[PDB]
Amino acid sequence: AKRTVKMGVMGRYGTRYGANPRKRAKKLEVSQHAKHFCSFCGKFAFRRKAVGIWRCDGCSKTVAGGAYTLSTPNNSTVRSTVRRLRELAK
Amino acid sequence: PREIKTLKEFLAICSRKDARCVKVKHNPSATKFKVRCSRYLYTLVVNDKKKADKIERSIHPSVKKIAVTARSHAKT
Amino acid sequence: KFLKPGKVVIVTAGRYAGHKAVIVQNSDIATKERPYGRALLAGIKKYPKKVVRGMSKQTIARRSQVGVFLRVVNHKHFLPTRYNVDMSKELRGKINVSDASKRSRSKRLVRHVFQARYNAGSSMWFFQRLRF
């Protein structure tokens, strides 16, 4: 069946720590333990090892970046900026 | 300790200078020729009781033969 | 199509990993007791060393010896190169492998031909060692 209503992974903590600090931690505890997309290897296999360290379980590629999610949204703003600025020099 | 396969290798070991004593152990099934050389103890397991006594006669001249018995506590 | 006899390959698997080899005979279709595509390779077991000025002859002549192998290898265990070595149509007729003594007498023949390519200086890429 379905085991809890809306405390998902945070049911670990019981009736502790306040309702909303469990919810700010919930979006990032789900994110770091979810398997992300290996754009190198085509698979959904990036699991975070340590903080900022990700590893494709299919491709054995180790990617630095992002504490709780593989690519932080400030990175994709930077990757587009570098890609644009190397087109103006070629 | 090692183990001799054939009889052509047993007579080479008993010809050696380090071979102090061959100990002869009569099991109820086989016999054992335990050559005590300076590092290893070489054993030839002869399963046939008639071929065993023929092998004892070929190590007559100048190697020490010992009939292994059960030495009691009183010899000490 | 492109795996013609007389073509330099580089052996990618086995005890001869990374050695150059030329294709002698070729079998693109699989068969019983060798259920795979394959090629009779005649490669270099031991490359000739470099000689410098100062070395005497009988030191140059010993350092410039090629050693060969003559041996059937699966097609996925070598890597074909655009480079070629002119295996004539009359020379691979003299290379038998389906014997024990006519594989020894055919390995001395390949060793003599590669030595003649090496002393004449033809196809000097084939006699350079692949450094990985």
């Binding site: - | - | 580089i10 990618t12 005890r15 990993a17 990374g18 890597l79 190169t81 692949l130 450094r131 990985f132």
Partner: protein, 62 residues
Amino acid sequence: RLASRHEKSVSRAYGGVLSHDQVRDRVVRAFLVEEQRIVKQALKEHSKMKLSHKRTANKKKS
């Protein structure tokens, strides 16, 4: 230390250091990365000599 070399190695290149799936991935890139530069080096000398008769052939045109 007391064992033979064969319990600790294997008969090919980098034996006892690298495995079969990556001895070959170095043989393949020692050929393909050397030969890719030869394609780009010989393209470079073919370009500079075509420049050596794009303008030196303009000595007979004015």
